[PDB]
């Protein structure tokens, strides 16, 4: 289909309780495939999907080395950030990095990413050109200047256009049973009386993969955006996701309301109504 690969990294300092904890996970689309936690008994990058297990020791050795090296650099960078922001050493701080690539149906690069956040706020991001930077503030500009001096973007571009795309292709093929299978939503509408005067209609979508979905209510064909309660798409724990959308309907109006569902696993968008 269109597809993505992402690596997520978080270091959280904890002054007086040892060294910062480092956790990194890798995803293809919405499927977790690798993990590393510095607080693990014997930290190694570990597989989380059957299709990666076939990779050889050379792969795992290099992944684990990379993980450990980043834990170390993140610790140095956390120290640097205290200086850049004129901060005390007493508090816990957070440093995050996301990078990866999006590819289209033909396997060609659509977009690459490489960006960081400090204490939950944008710090520095590689622009879509894979050649220039956006620094959030005058502290990040210090890093920008160093990274421009060292031609960092050129090195990241090479990865994002190269190994990122090629290895994502490989994973898609090795994991084609699951990664290239869309599970459509199982859908139904439920009715929950609130009072004599009104009831909730809740439109459910269950057991779908990947997570992207659109769930809408209309009344007399008009979208009910402002009156629809829409929950965040949530993991079921069996690889699939769930979502619902609910509206409060006056008694006897239920047939004016229609639930509309779009998912890549569906050949045509669905229309549902409450069926007493």
């Amino acid at each position: 289909g269109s597809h993505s690969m992402r690596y997520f990294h978080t270091s959280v300092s904890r002054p007086g309780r040892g060294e910062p904890r480092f956790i990194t996970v890798g995803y293809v689309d919405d499927t977790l495939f690798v993990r590393f936690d510095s607080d693990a008994a014997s930290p190694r990058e570990e597989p989380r999907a059957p299709w990666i297990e076939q990779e050889g020791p050379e792969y795992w050795d290099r992944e684990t080395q990379i993980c450990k090296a980043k834990a170390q650099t993140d610790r140095e960078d956390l120290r640097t950030l205290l200086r850049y922001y004129n901060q005390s050493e007493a508090g816990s701080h957070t440093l995050q990095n996301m990078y990866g690539c999006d590819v289209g149906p033909d396997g060609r690069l659509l977009r690459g990413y490489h960006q960081h956040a400090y204490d939950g706020k944008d710090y520095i991001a590689l622009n879509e050109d894979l050649s220039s930077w956006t620094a959030a503030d005058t502290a990040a500009q210090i890093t920008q200047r160093k990274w421009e001096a060292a031609r960092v973007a050129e090195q990241l571009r090479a990865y994002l256009e190269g190994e990122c795309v090629e290895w994502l292709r490989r994973y898609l093929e090795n994991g084609k049973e699951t990664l290239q299978r869309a599970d459509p939503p199982k859908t139904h509408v439920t009715h929950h009386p609130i009072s004599d005067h009104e009831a909730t209609l809740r439109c459910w979508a269950l057991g779908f993969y990947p997570a992207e979905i659109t769930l809408t209510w209309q009344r007399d064909g008009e979208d009910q955006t402002q009156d629809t309660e829409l929950v965040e798409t949530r993991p079921a724990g069996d690889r699939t996701f769930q979502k619902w959308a609910a509206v409060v309907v006056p008694s006897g109006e239920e047939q004016r309301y229609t639930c509309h569902v779009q998912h890549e696993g569906l050949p045509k968008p669905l229309t549902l109504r409450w069926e007493p």
Binding site: G26, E63, I66, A69, E76, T80, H114, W147, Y159, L160
Partner: peptide, 9 residues
């Protein structure tokens, strides 16, 4: 597969 890390901040 992962990337080489960038330089320090």
């Amino acid at each position: 597969i992962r990337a080489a890390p960038p330089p320090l901040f």
